């Protein structure tokens, strides 16, 4: 029960785990998910770039 | 183990209506308390009990 995933490039690297605990697993280095509109733009009413902010 | 962050609460008992007994029956009784866990009880992170000590290997 292996898992072939991609390597970091600019191939694949097969992986199998041997331990019964998920804590015994390797780090999760390949999660490039992102969402800055929690911090950049946490405003209630939408702010459009091309429009005057205060109208 | 104790920690005030992890404080639990207090269990108290009070007389609601005093103990009424007839004549010729004892006026001082006893109550017994029993402790069991409910269906949602669970314990975590295994360690050694502080309740069993040893100075030398028993013989």
């Amino acid at each position: 029960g292996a898992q072939v995933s991609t390597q970091k490039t600019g191939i694949h690297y097969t992986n199998i785990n041997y331990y019964k605990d998920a804590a015994s697993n390797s780090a999760n280095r390949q999660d490039f998910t992102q969402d800055p509109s929690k911090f950049t733009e946490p405003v209630k009413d939408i702010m459009i770039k091309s429009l005057p902010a205060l109208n | 183990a104790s920690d005030e962050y992890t404080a639990g609460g207090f269990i108290t008992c009070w007389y609601q209506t005093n103990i009424v007994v007839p004549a010729d029956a004892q006026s001082s009784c006893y109550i017994m308390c029993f402790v069991s866990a409910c269906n949602d009880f669970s314990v975590r992170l295994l360690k050694d009990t502080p309740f069993i000590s040893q100075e030398n290997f028993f013989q």
Binding site: - | Q16, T17, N18, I19, V20, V21, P22, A23, D24, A25, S27
Partner: protein
Amino acid sequence: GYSDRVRSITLGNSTITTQECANVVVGYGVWPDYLKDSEATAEDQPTQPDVATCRFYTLDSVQWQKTSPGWWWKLPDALSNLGLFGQNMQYHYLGRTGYTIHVQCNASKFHQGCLLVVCVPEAEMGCATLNNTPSSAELLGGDTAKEFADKPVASGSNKLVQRVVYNAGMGVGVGNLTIFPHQWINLRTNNSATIVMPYTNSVPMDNMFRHNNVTLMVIPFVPLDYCPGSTTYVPITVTIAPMCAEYNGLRLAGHQ
């Protein structure tokens, strides 16, 4: 395996058990509920605390003696100082509630006696001195039972309630109090009395300090007795639980 004698009432944090009882006497056949949009006047949205207000508040115990005439507790004023029922009651101009009144009194097989547990809607009481009206401190007793009198109260220049039990402090016949929802605690067969009072009033909501809509009265019709040896201290404990309490008109706290 059942029994008409067993019971268990759960309201909020509190549960109440009985191993000897009669039915639960439900108000005027009415079980308490909230105010309808059809019957409402106050346009502001109510606070209905729920589990915080409608729960079992056990006031002070009182001692039943071979010579006790009776006792009475006004209703909004009794719990006026108890928990969050008393708080909401102070911050709010208007309030509305029903109750589950559980009067508890246990004796033994060698003890005898019989109490009338009534709920008198609007127990407007009289004064000892005919010209005056009793004082607020004479009619009311917060969580501390006010007691009836064995014999006529003297009409000086007082504002004393005319407490003689046989007239119930209302100028009526105490034996006819049986029209108001009630039960009896005949020590021979009973152990407690439970009365579920619905909201009785001519207005949808009223102020809880200015007007006490119901008055609980515990009057012993057949006196406590027992032969020597039989335990002498027989207390009566009153446990009341608000039911479907709403509060309209929020402002600062108090009454004035």
